[model samples]
Target: SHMSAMAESKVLVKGTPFNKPVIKGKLENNYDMSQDEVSLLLFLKTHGGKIPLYRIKNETGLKDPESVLKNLMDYGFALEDKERLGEKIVLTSEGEFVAQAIRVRDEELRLKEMKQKKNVNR
Candidate 1:
């Protein structure tokens, strides 16, 4: 009776399917940075990749701009160069690339959204 009771216990294996979901449209939020950081980069891009610190601080509502700038510098994305006029910040090649990507993505997203709205009206 004891031998028969032990035989009843057995291990079982399970199987499952592996599949990924399909993507529908262009996805934003790809960069691992805050909007403030992107804003500063894009601002510099528009201004020829260099601008005064005061202008940035005055024009944007970025809290702790100094800290944000330093963070960017640490990532080798930008730098603060000593210019004759004032304290100016400049972007590196890598920084320029990032700014370009941000600008293009934003523009395309806006275009898509506007087109969708226009279609709705038609």
Candidate 2:
């Protein structure tokens, strides 16, 4: 019932998906995460797979202070180097294609912004 709401990402370009739509739904009116945090490292890997503090606006976030991130329960496809980020992260051939797509999209957005700014100046 609650899962369906979080999976929908229609306006990904201009907006980011929420970290927790269930709690956020009752808390901040169901606000999503910011798009700026969506970096290439996200798909590659993370530092410690730590829980996101930014999303937990409430004072009561996590119970364990020594806890580290396991894996994002949602769309995250987390791999492990004994479960820690080291030399690098691994990606599948399919993931490689996705990474390339990410790069291409970045370039396109850059060009799009450049053109928009240029037109504004003109």
Candidate 3:
């Protein structure tokens, strides 16, 4: 399993249990992914479309992507680059959909924070 050192922290960090990465999808309220999983998706998509497990580096809570990567593959959001010898993870179109959705959500949250700060100053 992909476990992070900060799993028990209250920092609201990524790759931990506190921050879950979810999409609105066809349903409402909740989705299956955690923040770590979504971070892995975005990382794979951004870093030349493929990533090696040992060298995987992401800021969005993706401390270890092995378990999350497996889920992503099963969810049609990612694929294994079997052309390589080891685990080389890549993102699919579905993964892109998720990345963009989460990106927008983050942007909106930041915007909301900025507005709140302005209000506080006023």
Candidate 4:
């Protein structure tokens, strides 16, 4: 009955597949971290929370890592030693906390999608 008209007319209405937006959660609302922000934070988190200045450019693959680093430093989440030209940078405790939260948010999203897939199959 639902397709009676389409069956007779032989017209199949088609639409693009649904696209999921950016991950949603508490942290998503409380802290709006951009793609670059998340990437850098996760990078630092995995790499012992400290790295050489030049290492960022070589490893982070960011378009403008300097500005991003500056932002994190200004936010009090990171620090750069003034004595060195581009060395002795470290992610503060606050940065680690934020990075861990971001990681958890991602895990929750993944789990949510997994349950959805199972429910759909049922």
What is the number of backbone collisions in each predicted candidate, taken in the order shown? 0, 2, 5, 0
lDDT of each: 0.66, 0.34, 0.60, 0.67
> Per-residue alpha-carbon lDDT of model 1 for 46-107, expressed as tens digits?
98999889987887678778776765665556788987878889987666766786788889
Worst 10 residues of 1 by lDDT: 7-16
| lDDT of model 2, residue 68 | 18
Model 1 regions lying over 4 Å from their true place:
1-30, 120-122
For residues 8-115, write the lDDT of model 4, one tens digit per residue. 211122123563222223466535556786788788888998888888888889989987777666555577865546576787766676677788888899988898
The C-alpha RMSD in Å for every predicted model, in order, reads 18.7, 12.0, 10.7, 19.1
Order of models, best TM-score first: 1, 4, 3, 2
> Which clashing pairs does model 1 show?
none
Q: Write the per-residue lDDT of candidate 2 for residues 1-122, one digit (tens) a residue.
A: 76664443322222126431122211122124223223422334333332344332222244431121222223232223333432223433322333344456677879888888557654
RMSD of model 4 against the true structure = 19.1
Model 1: per-residue Cα lDDT at residue 4: 46
Give each model a TM-score.
Answer: 0.67, 0.32, 0.59, 0.65
Top candidate, metric TM-score: 1
